[PDB]
Amino acid sequence: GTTTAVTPSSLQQEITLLCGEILYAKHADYKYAAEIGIQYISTALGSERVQQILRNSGSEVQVVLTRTYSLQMLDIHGVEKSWVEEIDKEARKTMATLLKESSGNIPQNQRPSAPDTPIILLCVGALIFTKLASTIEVGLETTVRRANRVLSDALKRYPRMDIPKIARSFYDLFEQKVYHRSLFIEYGKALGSSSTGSKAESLFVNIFMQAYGAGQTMLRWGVIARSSNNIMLGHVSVQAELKQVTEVYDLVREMGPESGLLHLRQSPKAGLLSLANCPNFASVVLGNASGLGIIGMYRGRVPNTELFSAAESYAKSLKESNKINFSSLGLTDEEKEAAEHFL
Amino acid sequence: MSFPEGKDILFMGNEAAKLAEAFQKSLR
């Protein structure tokens, strides 16, 4: 069957160093950077607990423990030794050079051994994870731009950190190893509970927690359409979808915020989160969002363009006459900023 | 975030249908 790496908690310091080495130097290839981040998670949660989590996600993947060898290196299952050795070599070369230029005096928080380097690495992963959780498609480059602002302080400490290539590594990992989405969820839930409130942990938790709302975006926009009193919500073809609209909101009502992860998890009920069974409703919901100015750069499907345009015109006229109560809508801060151009 | 029932999101009834139809018609 299929296999994947876990790393025992006894090697937490060593995997921490490897994460730091990824950030610390300008590397040619970041292919397995995301997998190293995952290895840190496994030391945090415990390798046997990871096997449980994967099994429970519906995967029969078998975990294989990381070992050590000397040329001290980590032997990580499914990660080419040449890659790990090259990351380490390039980091150590860079450190030797910089250490000498600074006469042996480099602050801890600029070194690859700084304890928050795995968390920093995982913050890039967290942004890719919340991108993935959303029912609204955005380009990877958009997310990369966001990572640059969010991790501006990390970039001052680690000015050779290659965010776009690290981002691509996490993007690929979540596409190829779907079970590691479930592992990431358990880590985020665990850290949400155990966070010391440090800067790195707080950033991770704040990004991670956005995944729930991201999954529910279109349903939240639906409520916004009603709070906007969009009269196209009364169109005959929309009223006809009442049982389907009911199924959709019954889902989130009964499940609570966890339902936001169904898209990410590729659950059989994920389509509901994208309003797949109620296309006319969806068109009014999207049109209303467009009219309010909160839809951003939406490249997704508009099932009924006439309904969309009508809903958009109506929202827009209410907006232009200052008849929208923007405080009461339940907008995100970014949506508020987009619609009103102040926060 | 508190989600209402679907029947509290849509505008149901003949009157609501006629209102939406009229607005749509006004847009040519």
Numbering used by the authors:
A (entry chain A): 30 to 100, 112 to 383
B (entry chain B): 1 to 28
Paste lines from the article.
HMPV (Paramyxoviridae, subfamily Pneumovirinae) is a leading cause of serious respiratory tract infections in children, the elderly, and immunocompromised individuals. In all members of the Mononegavirales, the RNA genome is packaged in the form of a nucleocapsid, a ribonucleoprotein complex consisting of polymerized viral nucleoproteins (N) and RNA. Besides protecting the viral genome from host nucleases, the nucleocapsid serves as the template for transcription by the viral RNA-dependent RNA polymerase L. Nucleocapsid assembly necessitates a pool of monomeric, RNA-free N, termed N0, which is kept in an unassembled state through an interaction with an N-terminal portion of the polymerase cofactor P, until delivered to the sites of viral RNA synthesis. In conclusion, the reported structures of a paramyxoviral N protein reveal two distinct conformational states, N bound either to the polymerase cofactor P or to RNA.
